Design a protein around this motif. Structure first.
Motif, PDB file in Angstrom:
ATOM      1  N   UNK A 229     -15.915  -5.252 -15.269  1.00 39.78           N
ATOM      2  CA  UNK A 229     -16.024  -3.821 -14.977  1.00 39.78           C
ATOM      3  C   UNK A 229     -16.769  -3.587 -13.662  1.00 39.78           C
ATOM      4  N   UNK A 230     -17.914  -4.251 -13.487  1.00 40.67           N
ATOM      5  CA  UNK A 230     -18.749  -4.132 -12.286  1.00 40.67           C
ATOM      6  C   UNK A 230     -17.938  -4.495 -11.041  1.00 40.67           C
ATOM      7  N   UNK A 231     -17.228  -5.618 -11.151  1.00 38.28           N
ATOM      8  CA  UNK A 231     -16.391  -6.133 -10.076  1.00 38.28           C
ATOM      9  C   UNK A 231     -15.326  -5.104  -9.691  1.00 38.28           C
ATOM     10  N   UNK A 232     -14.696  -4.545 -10.724  1.00 33.82           N
ATOM     11  CA  UNK A 232     -13.658  -3.538 -10.558  1.00 33.82           C
ATOM     12  C   UNK A 232     -14.205  -2.323  -9.804  1.00 33.82           C
ATOM     13  N   UNK A 233     -15.391  -1.894 -10.229  1.00 37.23           N
ATOM     14  CA  UNK A 233     -16.091  -0.757  -9.632  1.00 37.23           C
ATOM     15  C   UNK A 233     -16.337  -1.009  -8.150  1.00 37.23           C
ATOM     16  N   UNK A 234     -16.804  -2.221  -7.859  1.00 38.53           N
ATOM     17  CA  UNK A 234     -17.099  -2.644  -6.498  1.00 38.53           C
ATOM     18  C   UNK A 234     -15.847  -2.576  -5.635  1.00 38.53           C
ATOM     19  N   UNK A 235     -14.744  -3.080  -6.196  1.00 37.03           N
ATOM     20  CA  UNK A 235     -13.420  -3.085  -5.561  1.00 37.03           C
ATOM     21  C   UNK A 235     -13.033  -1.649  -5.182  1.00 37.03           C
ATOM     22  N   UNK A 236     -13.193  -0.777  -6.173  1.00 35.58           N
ATOM     23  CA  UNK A 236     -12.848   0.634  -6.040  1.00 35.58           C
ATOM     24  C   UNK A 236     -13.740   1.293  -5.000  1.00 35.58           C
ATOM     25  N   UNK A 237     -15.040   1.024  -5.144  1.00 33.71           N
ATOM     26  CA  UNK A 237     -16.060   1.639  -4.305  1.00 33.71           C
ATOM     27  C   UNK A 237     -15.840   1.278  -2.846  1.00 33.71           C
ATOM     28  N   UNK A 238     -15.595  -0.011  -2.624  1.00 41.50           N
ATOM     29  CA  UNK A 238     -15.358  -0.547  -1.286  1.00 41.50           C
ATOM     30  C   UNK A 238     -14.151   0.129  -0.660  1.00 41.50           C
ATOM     31  N   UNK A 239     -13.089   0.246  -1.470  1.00 36.95           N
ATOM     32  CA  UNK A 239     -11.843   0.885  -1.038  1.00 36.95           C
ATOM     33  C   UNK A 239     -12.103   2.312  -0.587  1.00 36.95           C
ATOM     34  N   UNK A 240     -12.870   3.016  -1.417  1.00 39.77           N
ATOM     35  CA  UNK A 240     -13.235   4.408  -1.169  1.00 39.77           C
ATOM     36  C   UNK A 240     -13.977   4.540   0.151  1.00 39.77           C
ATOM     37  N   UNK A 241     -14.931   3.628   0.354  1.00 40.84           N
ATOM     38  CA  UNK A 241     -15.737   3.591   1.568  1.00 40.84           C
ATOM     39  C   UNK A 241     -14.850   3.413   2.795  1.00 40.84           C
ATOM     40  N   UNK A 242     -13.913   2.475   2.667  1.00 41.34           N
ATOM     41  CA  UNK A 242     -12.976   2.170   3.744  1.00 41.34           C
ATOM     42  C   UNK A 242     -12.145   3.409   4.091  1.00 41.34           C
ATOM     43  N   UNK A 243     -11.682   4.099   3.051  1.00 38.32           N
ATOM     44  CA  UNK A 243     -10.901   5.316   3.202  1.00 38.32           C
ATOM     45  C   UNK A 243     -11.673   6.462   3.883  1.00 38.32           C
ATOM     46  N   UNK A 244     -12.815   6.815   3.296  1.00 35.86           N
ATOM     47  CA  UNK A 244     -13.478   8.093   3.565  1.00 35.86           C
ATOM     48  C   UNK A 244     -14.565   8.043   4.639  1.00 35.86           C
ATOM     49  N   UNK A 245     -14.863   6.834   5.126  1.00 30.82           N
ATOM     50  CA  UNK A 245     -15.907   6.565   6.139  1.00 30.82           C
ATOM     51  C   UNK A 245     -17.343   6.802   5.638  1.00 30.82           C
ATOM     52  N   UNK A 246     -17.488   7.665   4.631  1.00 37.64           N
ATOM     53  CA  UNK A 246     -18.770   7.977   3.986  1.00 37.64           C
ATOM     54  C   UNK A 246     -18.529   8.342   2.514  1.00 37.64           C
ATOM     55  N   UNK A 247     -19.346   7.786   1.620  1.00 37.06           N
ATOM     56  CA  UNK A 247     -19.255   8.115   0.194  1.00 37.06           C
ATOM     57  C   UNK A 247     -20.639   8.332  -0.420  1.00 37.06           C
TER      58      UNK A 247
END
Ligand code: MG
Ligand code: MG
Ligand code: MG
Ligand code: MG
Ligand code: MG
Ligand code: MG
Ligand code: MG
Ligand code: MG
Ligand code: MG
Ligand code: MG
Ligand code: MG
Ligand code: MG
Ligand code: MG
Ligand code: MG
Ligand code: MG
Ligand code: MG
Ligand code: MG
Ligand code: MG
Ligand code: MG
Ligand code: MG
Ligand code: MG
Ligand code: MG
Ligand code: MG
Ligand code: MG
Ligand code: MG
Ligand code: MG
Ligand code: MG
Ligand code: MG
Ligand code: MG
Ligand code: MG
Lengths: 114, 120, 209, 64, 123, 56
Positions: free
Chosen positions: B16-34
């Motif tokens: 779950x943690x890993x998945x979250x990290x994957x998602x979070x990283x993706x979001x960061x890449x997308x939005x420049x700021x999260x």
RNA sequence: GAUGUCGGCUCAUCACAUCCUGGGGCUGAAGUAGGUCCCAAGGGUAUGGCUGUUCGCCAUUUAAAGUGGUACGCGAGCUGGGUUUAGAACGUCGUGAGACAGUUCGGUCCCUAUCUGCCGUGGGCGCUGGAGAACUGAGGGGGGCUGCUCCUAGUACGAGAGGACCGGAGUGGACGCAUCACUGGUGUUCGGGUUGUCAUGCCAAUGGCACUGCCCGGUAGCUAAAUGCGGAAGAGAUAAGUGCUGAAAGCAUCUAAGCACGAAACUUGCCCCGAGAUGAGUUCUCCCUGACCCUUUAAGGGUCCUGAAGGAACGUUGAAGACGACGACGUUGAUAGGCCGGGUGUGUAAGCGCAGCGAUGCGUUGAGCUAACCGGUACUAAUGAACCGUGAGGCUUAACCUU
RNA sequence: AAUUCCUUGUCGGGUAAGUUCCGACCUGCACGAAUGGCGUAAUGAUGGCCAGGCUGUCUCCACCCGAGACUCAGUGAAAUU
RNA sequence: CACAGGUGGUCAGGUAGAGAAUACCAAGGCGCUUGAGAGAACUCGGGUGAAGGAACUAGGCAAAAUGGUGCCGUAACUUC
RNA sequence: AGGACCGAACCGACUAAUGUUGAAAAAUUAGCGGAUGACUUGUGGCUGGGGGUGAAAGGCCAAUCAAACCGGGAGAUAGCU
């Protein structure tokens, strides 16, 4: 840690051959006998390689008189005189603890000739 | 006992943690700021920045590698083709932690995680 | 005899010509600088105040700085005291090396032990655990009983209970010193000493002998 | 004589569990041992297991 | 690392096969025995025609350990299973004469000199 | 695991002496504009160290 | 308008009417070995088999396998085998319902701790100008066991069988402290394999779920079965005991006069906590060196002014840590994350070309990947700053600069 | 013996050692013939006992992953007195 | 009680598989109305454990292991 | 053919472990038994308290059972508290 490393470096063996896991190796060991130091030959298979700098170790596997003998030798010791490799082992594995139960034809592995 | 056991667990199970990290990283890449919880943000640093570094080195194998932790077909492209020339003459330091306040519903320490080159 | 303060570099082993592995502790026994020599005339008793390491000139506090200035030497990361034997004289502006520990064969090493946190009754006092199976209901790693009954009324002081373990200056004694290195400020001693890598160690000589 | 007391085996709530009513008598030089856990009282048993012990001693002496 | 209730293979030719340790001999509360240590054993599997019989109690010495025995240089010598040599109760010397398998450098002393002489390989 | 007597209001008050919070020592000030904010946390606008970084 | 019972477990603890260790007397004590009696409780004082058992008996041990107390310790700590419910059966007694210190199979063990106690651990305030330190040590606690073998010597004895002494060395076992260098253990933040599957447009290549899907490994770290250490060596006052010289009592007497020894007991010596030791110790060092009023003229109230030492608090954090706390850093900075160079684990990644029908292999290539390792490097953030803290220190005597 | 108090009866087997178990003896306190007696294949979440295998049950516990317990914000009990 | 319980019938998508088992998924729905931390003992549900291998205990309770299809093979006893 | 067998649904309830002011006035979790029958279940119907029903435990008869619940005798009585 740097100082420790430095200490290790001068104490470490400068004449270790690059030996693979699974190799048929003869290990000349300095066994004590009464008072005089004697050389003993122990030829077997490399079943584990530990690499720690000075604390590096290697496990030799051979069956003696019926019972299998596992013997771990400290690589950077003056007790181990000669690392004499005869024939290499053709495996895609490092630590071969499956040989602990493997005996006979199952104990014999493919020969690396590369 | 956690003597030199680095890596904040964040309550969740490992996968779950890993998945979250994957998602979070993706979001960061997308939005420049999260906007995220501070510890979470901190944790994110030690997976996203490595991925960024990997991207900085442009090759097919690298892309394939990225197509794992980061996962997305567009996000990876963004990392490689756009975020690659973005960070060329800087060693590490792709992330920027800026604290803001608290997540009012539970009072959680909130921090804006962002890419350093945000302005341009 | 007076001790000397060091710092743990870590563990290593000596391979000897005869063929005996000696698990030596590598201690960064640096130039231990004297700050004050305690006496009988005004102070009361014989002791020596030593310092080891390096601290920033900006970070060091004013009174401490003043104290250091008075002495006449650079600041370290702390201060340590050692009880003097009757027949030793040292100056204020002085630095002691590992040269003093060249003669000794055994040493007693005090160190701030690895902090075990809030250890349980089993981990703290080496208790037997109750049955893991066999009916046992939520009691596996617990003390069991603590007292008796109505007769003692209380539970006795200093009883083996679960609590803080480690994070305490403690001594391991009669340790065989193998090699002495003055070139690179080292001490090499057979065995294991309390603390982690970088733990500030207190090395006394053989008070046991 | 070597006189030893212990708990009775079996049922009885709080009472039999907390009595040393049962007795065993052993002759020291011989090694012959006589037990009894019949009666409730210790004192009856002691004298009954002694009577039995005496009886057994006679047998030992009769048999020898 | 032999203890109580432990089964072991017979190293000698006395007339036994599988032997179970019943006491770790030589000290109070003693539990672990390495090579060259005396342990009281019972015989549980016996070769039909042999000197020693099934169900016999006697003291025996540890010859091979699966745990592994240590040298002063830190080297460990493991063995495939655990093995023992059967001794007499009074004289404290081996019953058998022909010993199969390798022995240890820790085994060799005044009492076990004979045993080492007998054994084909010493480690 | 139950009380045997009723503890005083006094005792309770004494207990509560530590349970009372620590007030924030002082506010932090932005040097350019003069915005009052929390320590190491950004302003209401998005200014930080005399520099607007976040639009929200 | 409730005192849970045996036993086992887990913890124990005190008691000596000491089982051993240890000291000593006597011995029908040649010697070993003892027996018993006096001292002496520091420590140690077994694993199993049968039984619900304690007990016991047996097997093996062991230096020894103490007897007891403590609600025959300990169920708001566990168990529930025995027992003390409801079912059932047997023998037995009762015409019968049923019953039996008769047996037999089955049969809910609740409680989040208020206080005391305890284990740890903080905060406040105190110790008298205020800090930062360094410590003494009032006291308290921990630890206090030993065997076996060899040397002295087959000699001090002894018909002989035999096998005796103080002292030292080696060396174990159980226990405690410390730790990871070793041997391993673990390792679901590292690698690799594989089964099923689904998803990434599709081949490939990956990912997700399946107890980590199942495994084979394995880094840092914690950790024991590991390896270092430790029981101290010793030193004082002793116990029973052993005496010495010596009277009442011309003998005679360990004693009334003095003086020596004698255990693991006790005071110190070893380690640790520890001046809240309120009797609050000492020592080093730094810092704050301002003007005015008021009613009651005083350890009064203040007013402005000043903010020092230092502290927090924050932030970064730590092999510190449940939480404070404790320790390291706050741009002069490696404090943290990542980065670069190195090191460890795993076993020639993918792409590419070759051979083979193809699976697959070959070459490419010990190949790429690699947590928490090490060393370097300010790449980002920990910025300017503020807040508490204050203001040269009280009264009474006295020893002196100037007796 | 689901019955035997005396009794852990005595002997044998099984075990290093077996109050349990299995075989036998019979002195049946107080079995016993449809409140059946005695055998009995199969059946049993049946009772007892033994052997192999297997294993953290245990020696002797170690680590790791999770949910709590611990801190913060939110709301907010209870028995008891 | 917006309670982990209790409630009858109809529908039966993919691959694997004897299977409506079980396993991922389609259709279609949800993330179980407190979170946020940190990462002590201890409790809970698990994973793995060197050497032993029942020594545990009342009792192998629990746990571990065994486990599938085809083929070979199979004892005492028996109501065959 | 089977009161056959393994085994889901379904029916139970042997074992543990949790839970015991519970998620729950008997449940969960892992295992366990039956599972074409003396099966199981829905819908409706009858049997009524000294009565019913009971493959029999004094079991069940609306969280109550060696005689249900409710109202009435009834402010039963209580040498007891
Ligand atoms: Mg939570
Ligand atoms: Mg136990
Ligand atoms: Mg229970
Ligand atoms: Mg319970
Ligand atoms: Mg449990
Ligand atoms: Mg109690
Ligand atoms: Mg009292
Ligand atoms: Mg006495
Ligand atoms: Mg009791
Ligand atoms: Mg009890
Ligand atoms: Mg019972
Ligand atoms: Mg309970
Ligand atoms: Mg018998
Ligand atoms: Mg019989
Ligand atoms: Mg009858
Ligand atoms: Mg008739
Ligand atoms: Mg009849
Ligand atoms: Mg048995
Ligand atoms: Mg194991
Ligand atoms: Mg809800
Ligand atoms: Mg399903
Ligand atoms: Mg194993
Ligand atoms: Mg037992
Ligand atoms: Mg047993
Ligand atoms: Mg089971
Ligand atoms: Mg059927
Ligand atoms: Mg179930
Ligand atoms: Mg059946
Ligand atoms: Mg009636
Ligand atoms: Mg009335």
């Amino acid at each position: 840690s740097n100082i420790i490393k430095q200490l290790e470096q001068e104490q470490m063996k400068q004449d270790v051959p690059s030996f693979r896991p699974g190799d048929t190796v003869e290990v000349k060991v300095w066994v004590v006998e009464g008072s005089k130091k004697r050389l003993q030959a122990f030829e077997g298979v490399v079943i584990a390689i530990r690499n720690r700098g000075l604390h590096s170790a290697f496990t030799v596997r051979k069956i003696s008189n019926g019972e299998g003998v596992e013997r771990v030798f400290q690589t950077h010791s003056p007790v181990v005189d000669s690392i004499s490799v005869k024939r290499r082992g053709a495996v895609r594995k490092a630590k071969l603890y499956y040989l602990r139960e493997r005996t006979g034809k199952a104990a014999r592995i493919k020969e690396r000739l590369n | 006992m956690r003597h030199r056991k680095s890596g904040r667990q964040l309550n969740r199970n490992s996968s779950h943690r890993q998945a979250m990290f994957r998602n979070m990283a993706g979001s960061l890449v997308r939005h420049e700021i999260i906007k995220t919880t501070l510890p979470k943000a901190k944790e994110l640093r030690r997976v996203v920045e490595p991925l960024i570094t990997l991207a900085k080195t442009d090759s097919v194998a690298n892309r394939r590698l990225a197509f794992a932790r980061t996962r997305d077909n567009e996000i990876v492209a963004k990392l490689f083709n756009e975020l690659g020339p973005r960070f060329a003459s800087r060693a590490g330091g792709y992330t920027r932690i800026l604290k803001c306040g608290f997540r009012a519903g539970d009072n959680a320490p909130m921090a804006y995680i962002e890419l350093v080159d945000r302005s341009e | 005899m007076i001790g000397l303060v060091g710092k743990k570099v870590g563990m290593t082993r000596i391979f000897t010509e005869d063929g005996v592995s000696i698990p030596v502790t590598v201690i960064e026994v640096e130039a231990n600088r004297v700050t004050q020599v305690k006496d009988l005339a005004n102070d009361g008793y014989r002791a020596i105040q030593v310092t080891t390491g390096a601290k920033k000139a900006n970070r060091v506090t004013k009174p401490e700085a003043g104290h250091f200035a008075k002495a006449g030497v650079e600041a370290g990361r702390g201060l340590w005291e050692f009880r003097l034997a009757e027949g030793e004289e040292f100056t204020v502006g002085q630095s002691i090396s590992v040269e003093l520990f060249a003669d000794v064969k055994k040493v007693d090493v005090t160190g701030t032990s690895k902090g075990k946190g809030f250890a349980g009754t089993v981990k703290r006092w080496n208790f037997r655990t109750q049955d893991a199976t066999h009916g046992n209901s939520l009691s596996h790693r617990v003390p069991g009983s603590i007292g008796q009954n109505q007769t003692p009324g209380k539970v006795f002081k200093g009883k083996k209970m679960a609590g803080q373990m480690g994070n305490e200056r403690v001594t391991v004694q009669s340790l065989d010193v193998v090699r002495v290195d003055a070139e690179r400020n080292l001490l090499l001693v057979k065995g294991a000493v309390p603390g982690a890598t970088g733990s500030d160690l207190i090395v006394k000589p053989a008070v046991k002998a | 004589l070597r006189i030893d007391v212990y708990r009775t085996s079996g049922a009885g709530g709080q009472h039999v569990n907390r009595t040393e009513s049962a007795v065993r008598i052993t002759h020291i030089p011989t090694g012959i041992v006589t037990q009894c856990q019949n009666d409730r009282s210790q004192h009856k048993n002691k004298d009954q297991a002694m009577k039995q012990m005496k009886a057994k001693l006679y047998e030992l002496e009769m048999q020898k | 690392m032999i203890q109580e209730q432990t089964m072991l293979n017979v190293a000698d030719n006395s007339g036994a096969r599988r032997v179970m340790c019943i006491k770790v001999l030589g000290g109070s509360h003693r539990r672990y025995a390495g090579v060259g240590d005396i342990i009281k054993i019972t015989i549980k599997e016996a070769i039909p025609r042999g000197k020693v019989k099934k169900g016999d109690v006697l003291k025996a010495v540890v010859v091979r350990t699966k745990k592994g025995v240590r040298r002063p240089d830190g080297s460990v010598i493991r063995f495939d299973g655990n093995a023992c040599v059967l001794l007499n109760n009074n004289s404290e010397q081996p019953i058998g004469t022909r010993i199969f398998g390798p022995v240890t450098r820790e085994l060799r002393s005044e009492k076990f000199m004979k045993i080492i002489s007998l054994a084909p390989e010493v480690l | 695991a139950v009380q045997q007597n009723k503890p005083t209001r006094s005792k309770r008050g004494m207990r509560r002496s530590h349970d009372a919070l620590t007030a924030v020592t002082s506010l932090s000030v932005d040097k350019t504009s003069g915005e009052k904010h929390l320590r190491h946390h950004i302003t209401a606008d998005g200014y930080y160290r005399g520099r607007k970084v976040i639009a929200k």
